Write a protein that binds this ligand. Sequence first.
Ligand SMILES: *[C@@H]1O[C@H](CO)[C@@H](O)[C@H](O)[C@H]1NC(C)=O
Lengths: 49, 49
Amino acid sequence: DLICAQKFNGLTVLPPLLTDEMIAQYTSALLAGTITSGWTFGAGAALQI
Amino acid sequence: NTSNQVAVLYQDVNCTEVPVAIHADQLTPTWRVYSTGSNVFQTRAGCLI
Ligand SMILES: *[C@@H]1O[C@H](CO)[C@@H](O)[C@H](O)[C@H]1NC(C)=O
């Protein structure tokens, strides 16, 4: 392998804190606020329109 | 300031290897009990004891 020669010599790789499906939950909560509230959810509570 | 208890993470390692990994029969007795218990949880970051 490419990674096994690195891993055998002290060179490790740490995982990210937010998983790739936590980051996708964040961008769907930003899509859902823009479609249903406009710009108001970035300045306070979300007001529908 | 709050307590004296600790948890220990063994990074990027399956915990079918930990008690022979930690120097269990050749160390202080307080490093000994941080290898066993019913509190063994396998994560992606490693194994959390
Ligand atoms: C850890 O050991 C268990 C025991 O079979 C295995 O199922 C699991 O895939 C192992 N994890 C590894 C090698 O990352």
